[PDB]
Each structure stands twice: as structure tokens, then as C-alpha cells.
Amino acid sequence: GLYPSYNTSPAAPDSTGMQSTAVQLAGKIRLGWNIGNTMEAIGGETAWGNPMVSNELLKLVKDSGFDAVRIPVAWDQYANQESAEISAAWLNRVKQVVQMAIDNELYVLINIHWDGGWLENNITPAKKDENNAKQKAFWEQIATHLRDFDEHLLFAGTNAPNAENAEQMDVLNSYLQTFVDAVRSTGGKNAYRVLVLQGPVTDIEKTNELWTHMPADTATDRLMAEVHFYTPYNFALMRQDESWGKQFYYWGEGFLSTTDTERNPTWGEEATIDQLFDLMKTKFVDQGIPVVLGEFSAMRRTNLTGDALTLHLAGRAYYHKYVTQQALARGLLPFYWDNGGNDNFSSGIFNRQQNTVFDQQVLDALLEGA
Template identity: 40%
Template sequence: MKISHLKKMATAALLGVGLFAAQGSLALSSIAPIANCKYVVNNSWGSGATASIEITNIRSTVISGWSVNWNYVNNRVTGSWNATVTGSNPYTATNLSWNANIQPGQTISIGVQVNGNGAIEAPTVYGSICTNSYNSTSSVTTSRSSSSSTAPSSRSSSSSLVLSSVSSSSSTSACSGVQQCNWYGTLYPLCVNTQSGWGYENNKSCISRATCTSQPSPFGVTGGACVPSSSSISSQSSSSIRSSISSSRSSSSSSLSCPQGNSWPDCPYTTWSDAYCAQVGPSLCPRSSSSTSSRSSSSVSSGGITSVELTKRMGIGWNVGNSLDAIGGETNWGNPLITQQLINSVKAAGFKTIRLPVAWSKFSDESNFVIQSAWMDRVEQVVNYALNADMYVVMNIHWDNGWMQPTYAQQAYVNNRLKIMWTQIATRFGNYDDRLLFAGTNEVMVDGDYGTPTAEYYTVQNSFNQTFVTAVRATGGKNATRHLVVQGFNTNIDHTVNFAKIPTDTVSNRLMMEVHYYDPYNFTLNTSSNITQWGSIATNPSATETWANESYTDAQFQKMKVNFVDKGVGVILGEYGVVSRTNIADHETYRNYWNEYITKSAYTRGLVPVYWDNGFGGNGGMALFDRASGAQLYPNLIQAIVKADD
């Protein structure tokens, strides 16, 4: 949205089968699920920090309910999210209802904010589910007897299990029966209960086996194979693991076998017993190797999916507006820090895409436009929140204090600055997959001039789009084929159709066009207007505009379909919405109807509708969610929007 008073204010496989217990032996049926628990400092500002406690299920069974503990020397917790945190050093975090279950291979994240009281710390996380040997500050207990080790071939669900005597230098293999769906180059969980299409289980999007296997080769079900243990160890980035393991394991056994008919979940499902398969169910034990034999994720190329095809997967989107785009800092416009809990709530409500407006001009050096690394870190953390929730992300350079003036006088300056900034941003995010899209700018216009652009204005604005595309492509890697979003002049549909020029690109069918929609203004944004009703359901002609009704809306989005979608250019409806007017009786009825109609009209014509949420839920605001808790403020409005994707 344009900066204004309204918009600102109102608006993992385990090595062998070791590391199960500190000492002695346990029955397999009594072993608690094992998790990798670690504490990661995400952002530090001297007197305090935000951090994540990440819990990764490294077993092949679900963790149902969890708690973890940690303690500091001087730091103290001042806030938390995604868990119930109790205690006052040591602290205990316990699951909430929505994240109690951690699926095999899944990572969940708990957030904390701390006061430093000195240096920022990264303590060890411990608890009954945590395998401390996966924490680089911890060590494995070495008082384990190799004489009591049991041969792999004799293990069953009723047998006792102890540490295997495997040298860390051996050719050990670690195996996992967890399978995923390689959906045209992106991995998603396979659904347990959903039998066809897409589902949403355990707080994540999933794909049914039937739908996954309907793709052409090499896509489809993948996973379930044995891999060298050296790979799984190195992925933990902990050299202390190797030395600790070798001290507790004999060199008498050189490999881990996965005998047919075992009940051992660390081996692939093809070796499991019939009884164990029946226990875990067909989602983890499909009893079919043919579907995976020719489908390897390493052979997948992301080059095949076009921008139009990608928009069909992006569903309905939501803007986390007036946060990272706030001038001066994330909380400067009154919103709290973005959290994983907020993003999870948005996903759970039915949204599939996050638009992330960002003001990047927090420079380490203003003379050469070098972006502060700490700001890069924070933006990346929020991007990961959305990706953790299996959402698409459209990340841009937003208004950013208005330095992108499309005039000949400013053209060279703006293009140089765009090139420098997008080169840094693209390089930082260069390894992210196709779920992350870059959008070059926002509502570019000459300040104060809302009229039809002159040839100078739209020519210069088109050059900004070309500079963005060229700069990103030049960074190479995944950015060479990343989906990129460019904007029409002031994101106005008519100006876009009449004046936008698609940039020259080095790859085909990977560009999208962005427009916004706030018609009619007197109903959508003007809180002083007496226009408080809209559309065919309106009952008072004097409170209703005579233009921008349903037929006008359909015609506008049809223009985008004919001129862009039908020509292979995907379209993002990057912003739309209506302010609340809680002081007007029945206004909410018309607000709901407008949002429902605009969303459906855009969606059915191939556009990706992305609602503008400014974080303010009171009179004149546009928030759908409480930014602090993630609670739905307007459930009926949310449902009116997301049901277009049903």
C-alpha cells in the first residue's frame, strides 16, 4: 500500500541405532521418540535478543506431546511464542495444542525474547525427548558396554535394544522409512488421512499419495532409502559427535544391516515386518517400491514450471503489512514483531501465500547502499517462518521512504541503487527454492501525481523493472530461473495494460505482473466518505457508488487475464481490501461481500489475490489477525476470502 496516514496508522537419520539411552538397554517399545533440540540466536541488539528453540524429530515415529528445558547464566526471558513457557531460570517450554505432534523429519520452532544482562547466550536445550549428543556443546555418555550389544538381525519390537558397536570410521548406513512427495521439484509431506488432492494435517500442507503419484516422472513419492551415516553425521555440524560415538563403540561390527521382516523403524519400509506395517499404516508403509524406483529428488529440475502454473498453486494470499516495511524498524508503526505463531495462524486459516513488504534501506553504509547484515538476518528469519508453514513468499522492496521516483532526472540514481540492493538481496536468498518469489518494487509513481502517467513516467518505471530482473538473474544459481514479479505503473490495472513492458529475460515463462485493486476508493479507503455500501446487495443508493460494481470488477480482472495470463505471464493481485468502519451500522456486511467478490473474481481469472492487512483491527483498520497472538479478529471476513480457493 502507498505510505499515508491511513496505511501507516489506521491501517536426519540417526547413526546406526546408537544414542538411544545414556546407559544400559531399553525395550524398543518403551523408547521415547528422539529429537534434535537446539537453541539458535536469531537477532541480537546488544541489550537483548530473539532466539528460536528448534526441535527436529529424527525418528520414524510421531512425537506426541513434548516439553524442553534450558537455563541461562545472565539472560532472562521476557516474551515467548509457539509454546507455554514457565519457570524463571531454568525455563520449561511445553507444546500448545496445534504443535503437540511432531511428524518424522519435521522441525518445529519455539520463539523467545530475552534481556541480555550481559553477553547473549546460546544455552543447551535438554529434556526427555532431546538427544544431547546432537548439541555441539554436549557430549555422549561413554559408559556403555559393548559386550551387551545386540546384533541387528536379532532385533524386534519386543527385544531389548542397546547401543550398536559401530566404529565411527566404518561404512555404516542409517536408514529412514519416511517418504515425501516430490511435487514438481518441491518436497511436501504425504497425507495420512487425506485420500486425494491436497490436505492440511499436523499444521502442514500435505499431498495425498494418489495425487502425488499422478505426476509424470521423475516427480512423485520419494524417500525411504538408506544413506551413508557419514552424511547424516555431517549434516548435524558437530565434530564432537564423532569422537564421542567412537569412544563408546567397538570396531567389531562394520555395518548396520536392515534384515527383511524386522520391526525397526530406522530401516526402509521395504524391510519392515507385516505386523509393523499394519501398526504404522499405509502412509508410512505403502508396500510398493515401484513408485520410488525412478523418482529421485536429485534429478528434479525446477525449470519446467511456468509462472502461470505456479500461480495456480499459490491460492489466496495475505500481506503482513506495516511491519518489515515500516520506516525505521519493524515495530515503528505500532505492530509487534512477526512470529512463527502468527504465520502458523494465517496458514491454518486457509491462506497459502505470504506477501512480505520490506523497507531495505537500513544501510551499514549509506554511501554505497550496503544493507545491514542484522536486517538481512531478520528478514530471512521471517521468510523461514512462512516456508516452515509450507507457504509461498512474495518478498519485495516496498515504498522504502519513496526513493523510486520515475523521472528522467532520477532514473540513473534509482536504477543504480536498485541494482546494488537487489544484487545483495538475491545473493543472500539465492539458495531458496521456488516457494520464494522476488518482487522488484511496489506502487511506483511520481509523488502526488495520481493521473495517467506521461511517457516519461512509464518509460522510466519500466526501466526499473528491467534493472531488477537483470540484477537478480546475474547472481546465478537458483536465481537464474527464480520466478520474479514486476509491477505496472502505480500497480493500476489500466496503466498496466496500457503502458507496462515485460522485461527482457534470460529464461522463458518465469515472470509475473503485479497490480493492486482498491476501487471504488470512497468505499474501500476513504473513512470520511458517506459511501458505506457496495454492490448488488446495497439497499441505499445514496450510500453506494455508481461505478466500480461487480461488472466493473470482472472487466478489470478480465483485462489482466487476456493481456497477461493468457499470454504466459502470471498475475499477482498484490493488495486489495476495505477498511473497517465499526461506527457504521451494517458496514461489515458490505465489507465482507466486497472482499468475497473481489477475491473470487480475481481467482477465477487466474490471478493470485493477496489481501492487505495493516495490523490494526479497530475502526479504519484492515487487520484480519491479532498480530501478537495470531487470533482471528474477523472470522467471517477471513472465510469470505479464503473460500474462493475451496
């Protein structure tokens, strides 16, 4: 015991308002939004340029057509590093935000995010035992504190764990088992709550190659799997050319350039996307396990001008419609990555500071795709 037990008030199993299976829950969610660069920001909730989450932002997200939110949360910067005790004020603030999302009729997925890298960059034998102790300490405290919410609240163990081979997968499987067991041990509605488990780097290919088994659960049929999607990188996140490839400015049948053809895609087009989602339909969906697509988005290139600017924005939108539609046909639940920015290379579709829509084009695209 590197840390004290934080499972000091376990409750009797309770299935009141927890009656859906993972499959039945997935059936109610077609379109999700990440509260990005907010509760997981290093230095505090407002340290990366966004305001504190408000009832009126969450009301906008619902009234705009979203069924759910993913809330990345930071934890380690708020904890005593001797005891792994998390600040009681932070635990109360996260509870308050969950309460507000549930009051607006959203499903809610809370995680431990990158969180400064303590677990995420450390999927190794050297770090396995200390990280298993922290994972257990933090999840005992988070689940105890959020124990009383109904099935609108889901928990996700990790974000994008850096596991690249089989030895790293075994280490991750251990991390994921410590999660499940910590949650169930606190015994509320947490006896039956749907938990979400992350594939290696939440990458589709690595997950296809390396994924073996889902963790063991005292509960029956209450697990989903998680991947993310920034494919192709050159289009969605690349901000400068390298020896190994060029930024793509344009995407999709119908929206390719005739004047500027090096800035069209050399790979990662409609058919590749179809192929990638199919791998997750076979491994998980066809086998009674829903798949959360926890993060996707291509960034705005508002440094372009003229017909270049207009063609980029037309393909950028189609990219978002196509991903959403094709994800949902295969049983993947699409959650849009929104960092809140409205400047060059950002992903915010709302203006957080005025609670208005900033990018009506991409919002329309996600809804048409849904």
C-alpha cells in the same frame, strides 16, 4: 560506479527444486495474505504497532487457509547512504522470516516497498541513473543473501511506482530491467527463480494504456505481472467527504440502503470489477503470463452504529468474496492487504498480539470466495 559491486560470490546456475514455470507456480496459489505494516515500517519492524513476525503468526496464516504471503520489506533506512551497504543484521532477519514461512509450507513474495519513496516517487529522467545504481546495489545484496531458497520464494522488484505517462513508463522499464539483471547475475537458484514485475502505480487502467513489453530474461517462462485493487476508493479507503464525492458505507447487490441512499455507490459495482479484471486476462493471462493481485482490501467502518453498522459489515464481506472469486476465474492471484489494526478504518483480520482471528466474517468471506 556510484556504489561498489555487491555481486562478489556469484554461484553456478542451479535448477534443483526450481522446476515449475511461472504458469505452473501460479496454479498452486489461490489465496494470499500481506504481512502489512511490519518489515516495511519506517523506524523499525515494530514501529507501526505490530509485533516482530513469529513462527506462530505464520502457522495461524497457513492453518487459516492461506497458500502464500506477500512480505513488504524496507531497505534504504537500513543502508549506508555512501556505499548502499545494507546492515548485515537486517539481511539476516529477513532471511530468518523467509525460512520460517517456508517451514510452514507458504509461498513467499519479498519486494522493495515504498521504502521512504526513493524509487517509488521518483520515476523520472532526472533520477533514472542514481536510482538504477541503488536498485542494482540493493538487489545484488538481497538476492545473494536469499540465493539458496527453492521455488517457494519469489522476488518483486518494486511496489507501486508512480508512472503516469509514456516517458515515465520508459524510466520504469529501465528500473525493472535493472532488477531482473541484478538477480540473474548472482547465479544461484536465482538463475531460474520466478520474478514479479509491477505495472504503473500497480493501477489496472494505466497498465492497460501504458504497458508495452516485459523485461528481457536469460531464463525461459519465469515472469509474472503485478497490479493492486482499491476500487472504488470511495468505499474501500475514503475517510471524509470532499467537493468531488461522498464516502460509500455500503456495497453489493442485496446490501444497499433505502433510508440513507447518498451512502450507496454511484460507481464501482460488480460489473465494473468484472470489466477491470478482463483487461488483465487479455493483456497477460491469455498470453501465458500470470497476474499477482498484490494488494486489495476495504477498511472496517466501526464508527457506524445500529442497522447502518450491520448493513456496512454485510456488504464489506461480500466485496471481499466477490473480488477473490472473480479474480481467480480470470487467472489473477488474490493477496489480501492486512495492516494489522483492529480499530476504526483498519484492515487487520488477525489479532497479531494474541495470534487469534479478529474478523471471522471477512476471513470466511475470502475462503468462500476461494
